[PDB]
Amino acid sequence: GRLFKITACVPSQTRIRTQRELQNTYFTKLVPYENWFREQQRIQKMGGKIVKVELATGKQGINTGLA
């Protein structure tokens, strides 16, 4: 189906994490269309900043054929 290619940076606002969190801090990943609204908001509420959003699968405005 439709897929988003996103990049974001999510900081630590509550505790001084001592385990390697750099992997969880700056990231790039594919997020299925049906999960982007929930994921985007998740990052937003965590004080994270969204750097890049692309429609990885390309086709915009599909009426039928979303699987």
């Binding site: 988003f4 974001a8 985007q40 990052i43 937003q44 004080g47 900043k49 969204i50």
Partner: protein, 161 residues
């Protein structure tokens, strides 16, 4: 995110200063408008669906946008669009209550223009629809509250353009 209170505290802190006169006035101004912001939010929540309905009717309905080939065609996309409007109205109300636009940068504009452009969501039409909501909201909350809410509706629009 921060409200008007915390925004001032933060600017003083970055300077390492206790609250000076200028800052104390900024704070008193917020406190004196609190009840008015609360009243407007109460009204907006009570008419949320109504605001979106009239706004859509005034700016999107009966156009290429809703006909076959439009980005608001298919019930699936029509719902996505009015859902976004519901979101804009709710966040604008929060920003209005907070007396500060940071929540919009953090929770609305944060990656929005990009998602929209990659999806092919018409930004000009979205802006027109939020503009319409600004008008509809103002006719329910009065001139003053309508102008304050307008500040936040416009903020969102500026971030999309």
């Amino acid at each position: 995110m921060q409200d008007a209170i915390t925004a001032v505290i933060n600017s003083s802190d970055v300077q390492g200063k206790y609250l000076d006169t200028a800052a104390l006035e900024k704070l008193k101004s917020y406190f004196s408008t609190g009840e008015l912001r609360v009243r407007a939010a109460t009204t907006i929540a009570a008419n949320a669906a109504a605001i979106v309905k009239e706004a859509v009717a005034k700016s999107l309905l009966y156009s290429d946008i809703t006909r076959p080939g439009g980005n608001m065609y298919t019930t699936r996309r029509y719902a996505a669009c009015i859902r976004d409007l519901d979101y804009y109205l709710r966040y604008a109300t929060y920003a209005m209550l907070a007396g500060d636009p940071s929540i919009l940068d953090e929770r609305v504009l944060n990656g929005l223009k990009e998602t929209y452009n990659s999806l092919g969501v018409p930004i000009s039409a979205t802006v027109q629809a939020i503009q319409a909501m600004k008008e509809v909201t103002a006719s329910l909350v009065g001139p003053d509250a309508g102008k304050e809410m307008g500040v936040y509706f416009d903020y969102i629009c500026s971030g999309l353009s």
